[PDB]
Structures are given as structure tokens and as C-alpha cells.
């Protein structure tokens, strides 16, 4: 176990906060506002994305937990991860799919709003035999609101900057793309020293299989559900990329506040494993899509 958690934990928090703020500014500095108003006036992809996220992902997590025979804590963790709003990293990576990026703003907003009022009920309905307690008040709302405001405020600043002085957009963006890139290494190794050794702790065939099959099933089901609704291919790509991703911070905080660290022995690094796996699948799908576009330019 981790004897010390003070190894630049606050420094890590602040450096990731700065990363998110800067990349949000750069991302919002290259996308309009009128298309957002059009999406709000005619909501078609938002509704299907929300129903896929809050009606299939929890169901997929429940079915996977039943099939793979996960323990109570592992089943609860995967269920919480499944019934989670799309993370900011989904917005970060959907730029590579270059698909209807203006829709992603209202997507994140509606996902956060729906999660805020639906996570208690949607987590209580599927908690039959798992965590007989109420669990309604243990879900963090302030964290959801903080994530929401950090996603939106720099996005609004970037939108205003693009609408006012487009000539300044290329200089702040491209250079920013450098700043968010190299600093990633500056924090990537920071994770390696922080995680230490976890090969014999968290790597379990059932947990590995569930963490492999959760984001992949989310991506596939989102894309299929968009396909049967006859949406734009860019819309299908962005819906899939948003429903596949999940927020692991919420699961980490809820598990930490609802159970002592002694009980969650290997589940402490489970959100990190899920994050690594979703990064791997996202990178793989980006490479596949880029190759498919390259072969037919």
C-alpha cells in the first residue's frame, strides 16, 4: 500500500488544473457559437447521447459484473464508472475525430446536469445486492459542479476570443498545443514515481477484462445507437467518443469516502487502470480513423 501520499500531490493537482484550463482555452478558441444555438433549438443528438449514457452504460456495467463474477466492491466500482458523465478527456480527444465540436459543449453541460440529478436514483436502482446502504448522499455534487465550471469558463473565454480577434487564434492555439504536449511528459513520469509498483496488486484477469470491455462497449454502442438514428457521421463520432469515456475522479472520491483504504486494497488503483485502458483504446481508434481517412483522402 501507499505509505505516503504527500509526494507533490498538491503540485500534481495544480499542474493538471493548469493543463485543463490552458487546453480548454485553446480548444474553445477555434469553434463558433451559432451552431451551439442551433443544437439547443433542435436537440436530436443530445437526447440520444443522454439515453445511451444513462440507460446502456449502467446496464452494460451491471451485465459485465454479473457475467465476470466481480466482487461487491469491484461491481460497485464498475457500476459507478459506467453511470458517470463523459469526462473532459472525451472533449479533449474528440478534436481528433473533428466531428461537430460545437455540440460537445451542450453535450458536457447536459451530461453534467442529468448526472447531478440522476446518479442517486440510477445508482440505487442497480444496487440490488450491492451496498444495501442508502448511498444517495455519498455521491459528490460539488466535484461535479467544479468540473462543470472548469470545463465551461475557459471554453467561454476561448469562444469570445475567437469571435473578437480571430487573427490571434493561430498563435495562441498552436503554441498552446506545444505547452500541453511537453508538460504532459513533465507529469507523465510524475505518475510513474507516484504509482510505484502495482503489477501484483490491481492486475486481475476479471478486473482487466471488465476494464477492457467497458469503454469498448461504450464506444461501439454509442456509435451503433447514433447509426440507427440517422445522424451526421461527425455527430455519430462525437456521440460515440463522449459516451465511451467516463470520469474516474468521481468513482475515486466516492469509494474513498464510503469505504476505508484497508477494505479497498487493489481497488485504489482501479480507476487509474481504467484510465490507462481508455487512453489506449482512444489512441487506437484515433489511429484507425486517421488511417481510414488517409487511404481515402
Amino acid at each position, epitope marked *: 500500500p501507499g505509505f505516503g501520499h504527500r509526494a507533490t500531490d498538491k503540485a500534481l493537482s495544480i499542474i493538471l488544473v493548469l493543463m485543463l484550463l490552458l487546453i480548454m482555452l485553446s480548444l474553445g478558441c477555434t469553434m463558433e457559437f451559432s451552431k451551439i444555438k442551433a443544437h439547443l433549438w433542435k436537440p436530436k443528438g443530445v437526447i440520444v447521447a443522454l439515453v445511451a449514457q444513462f440507460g446502456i452504460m449502467p446496464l452494460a456495467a451491471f451485465l459485465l459484473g*454479473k457475467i465476470f*463474477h466481480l*466482487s461487491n466492491i469491484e461491481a460497485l466500482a464498475i457500476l459507478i464508472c459506467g453511470c458517470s458523465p463523459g469526462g473532459n478527456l472525451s472533449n479533449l480527444f474528440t478534436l481528433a475525430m473533428k466531428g461537430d465540436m460545437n455540440l460537445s459543449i451542450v453535450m458536457t453541460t447536459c451530461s453534467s446536469f442529468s448526472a447531478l440529478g440522476m446518479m442517486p436514483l440510477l445508482l440505487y436502482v442497480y444496487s440490488k*445486492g*450491492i*451496498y*444495501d*446502504g442508502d448511498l444517495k448522499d455519498k455521491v459528490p455534487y460539488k466535484g461535479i459542479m467544479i468540473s462543470l465550471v472548469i470545463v465551461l469558463i475557459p471554453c467561454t473565454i476561448g469562444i469570445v476570443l475567437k469571435s473578437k480577434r480571430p487573427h490571434y487564434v493561430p498563435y495562441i492555439l498552436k503554441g498552446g498545443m506545444i505547452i500541453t504536449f511537453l508538460l504532459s511528459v513533465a507529469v507523465t513520469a510524475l505518475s510513474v514515481i507516484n504509482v510505484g509498483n502495482s503489477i501484483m496488486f490491481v492486475m486481475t484477469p476479471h478486473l482487466l477484462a471488465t476494464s477492457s470491455l467497458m469503454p469498448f462497449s461504450g464506444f461501439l454502442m454509442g456509435y451503433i445507437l447514433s447509426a440507427l438514428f440517422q445522424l451526421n457521421p461527425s455527430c455519430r463520432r462525437t456521440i460515440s467518443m463522449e459516451t465511451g469515456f467516463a470520469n474516474i475522479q468521481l468513482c475515486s472520491t466516492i469509494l474513498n469516502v464510503t469505504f*476505508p483504504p*484497508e477494505v479497498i486494497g487493489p481497488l485504489f488503483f482501479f480507476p487509474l487502470l481504467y484510465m490507462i485502458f481508455q487512453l489506449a483504446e482512444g489512441l487506437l481508434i484515433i489511429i484507425i480513423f486517421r488511417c481510414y481517412e488517409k487511404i481515402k483522402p
Partner: antibody
Amino acid sequence: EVQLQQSGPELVKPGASVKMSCKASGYTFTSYIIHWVKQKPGQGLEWIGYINPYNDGTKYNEKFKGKGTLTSDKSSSTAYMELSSLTSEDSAVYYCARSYYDGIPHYFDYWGQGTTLTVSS
Amino acid sequence: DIVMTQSPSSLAVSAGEKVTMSCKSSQSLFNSRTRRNYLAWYQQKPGQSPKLLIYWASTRESGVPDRFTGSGSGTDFTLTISSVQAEDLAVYYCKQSYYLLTFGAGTKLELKR
């Protein structure tokens, strides 16, 4: 190994206002939850409710929801029970038991010595 | 809720003849996700606190005599002793924890005359 210490037999008037103490110092207190079991003389065991010392969550049986009140002290590693409503038929033996709790309590692998509570004039 | 009913509730065995204590519960208290089969068999000697004998209805706690063996699934469970000693005269409750913590009526063992 691990043992549970009970406060000891208590006689109280039907005016209620009694407290029951169970001390557990053989392990990490917050890792396991504490259940309370009531036994009438010759009527078998009966469940009351359990308390989680970590998050201070308590679950009560339907019969004992009105009267039972469970509290925990991490500094003293103790569990306290208050009923505040006693009658002549409430005299019985109360046991405190320790159980693991992953998502559902497993079983009472360790029990207290038992405290006899008498209610009369 | 789930209620447990033990059929015999009273029996006497002298030296070696085996005993069968069975409580049929109410419904199938077997977890589909994990093959745990939540059920616990306890022993309560007179003037003593209850002692745990078997957990998950098939596995026995370390330190108990090997004569105590429990087998069951779904709703039907049985606890049997290969050879009954003078120290096995107690009350067994076959508690369950699948949904809510409920105890059985109890089975009392005596000595035949």
C-alpha cells in the same frame, strides 16, 4: 487474538435512559462493522442492527427502528447503544459482534461476552 | 423479508448416530454474481456467547472439529455431525445475511435415555 469487552450487567427502572458499551481493541476498528443481537431467555437470538465505525452509517431492523440508536467512538474504539424506551419485557441479553463488510455483512466471526439488561421496579 | 424455519428443533442422540439440522429459509438466497451462498451456521452453548461454526454454508471456520459439515444450496441446507460428542449439545440457528440479518428458531440437542 481479538476479543470484545462488554460493559456488564445493568439494572434500570422502567424509566429507560440506559446505555450499552462494547469495546473492541484487537484490530483496526474502522475495518469491520459492529452488530447488536438481542436474546430473550429461552426465545432464541434476534437481530437489531449494525453500525459502521468508518462512515458512521447505521442500519436498523424494522422492529427496533424506533428505539435503537447506535453510535461509535473511533478514539475509544467503542460502540454505544441507546434504547430510551424500556418496559418490563425488555430485560434480555445483548451481544455485540464483529463482521466484515465489503458490500454486505458476511458473518459474525467474533462475539462479545454478552450483557444482561434488567428492567423492573 | 426472509424467515428461516428449522424442522426438528429438538432431537437426542446418544453416542455416534448422525444428526441432520435443516432450515429451508423462504426463497433462493444464492447470489448469482458471486457463488457465495450467503448463510452461516452458529453454535450457542448454554451460558455462553454464540460461536461461529460454518460460513458460506459449505466452509467451516478454522479450529472447529472436522465432524461438523454443512451442505446446501438455494433454499435447502443441512448441517450434519459424523460423530456426536458430549460437547456438541448446544443450539444452532443457521443465520442468513443475503438480504437482511435474520436468525432461525434454533435446534436443541439432548442426550437419549
